[PDB]
Ligand binder design. Structure first.
Ligand SMILES: Cc1[nH]c2ccccc2c1CCN
Ligand SMILES: [Ca+2]
Length: 223
């Protein structure tokens, strides 16, 4: 997260870190046994880390649970990043409390102008690299579809939205991949892609979760 603020320990209780020997992506806990992330985060041998603040120190609220199955969306296209969503089932159910909690799926799509919270452990610099150990947060609005398509001609599908600031300076970044965009207490987006981080006229692009609720629910019900 570039241009954000330190969230505070366990103030984003649905945020997960995906670990394969190191943090490589975020995700969101949607019930006691399932996490949603980006399809571009797929790999084998994922350990899901819940209750994290500092990802390099054991602080006492963590739960570490291996993934038993990953399901990339059937229509994910890695060249265009259309349908950039994946589900991960945990080997055992997490213990839910005030600091480890699920985030609700949306019943409707959020409109442009809605303020959202984006969080992650990604790079905090637009040029160069500095990775934080504690979770960072950013409040940002959903942008109109017209402004989004004007920023990325020919690249925005109906399964994507832009959020952030056309002036630059505040954005998600590398390592925030797969993390949550929460608006009005519901999961509306997944950190997906962009042109660099925090550049002028290049807001972040996010998977539009409201288009996937039926697939998520049907998949969880049968797996
Ligand atoms: C999700 C993601 N991952 C990256 C890696 C390098 C540069 C930009 C990005 C972005 C977009 C940030 N808004
Ligand atoms: Ca920790």
């Amino acid at each position: 997260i570039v241009g954000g603020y330190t969230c505070g320990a366990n103030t984003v209780p649905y945020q997960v870190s995906l670990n394969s020997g190191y943090h490589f992506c975020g995700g969101s806990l949607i019930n006691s046994q399932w996490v949603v992330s980006a399809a571009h985060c797929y790999k084998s041998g994922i350990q899901v880390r819940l209750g994290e603040d500092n990802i390099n120190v054991v602080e006492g609220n963590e739960q570490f649970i291996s993934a038993s199955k990953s399901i990339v969306h059937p229509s994910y296209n890695s060249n265009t990043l259309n349908n950039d969503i994946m589900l991960i089932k945990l080997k055992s159910a997490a213990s839910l409390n005030s600091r480890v909690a699920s985030i609700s799926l949306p019943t409707s799509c959020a409109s442009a102008g809605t303020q959202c919270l984006i969080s992650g452990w990604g790079n905090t610099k637009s040029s160069g690299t500095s990775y934080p150990d504690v979770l960072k947060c950013l409040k940002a609005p959903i942008l109109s579809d017209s402004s989004c398509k004007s920023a990325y001609p020919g690249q925005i599908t109906s399964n994507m939205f832009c959020a952030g600031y056309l002036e630059g300076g505040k954005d998600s970044c590398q390592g925030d991949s797969g993390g949550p965009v929460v608006c009005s207490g519901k999961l509306q987006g997944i950190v997906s892609w962009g042109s660099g981080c925090a550049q002028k006229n290049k807001p972040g692009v996010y998977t539009k979760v409201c288009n996937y609720v039926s697939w998520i629910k049907q998949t969880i019900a049968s797996n």
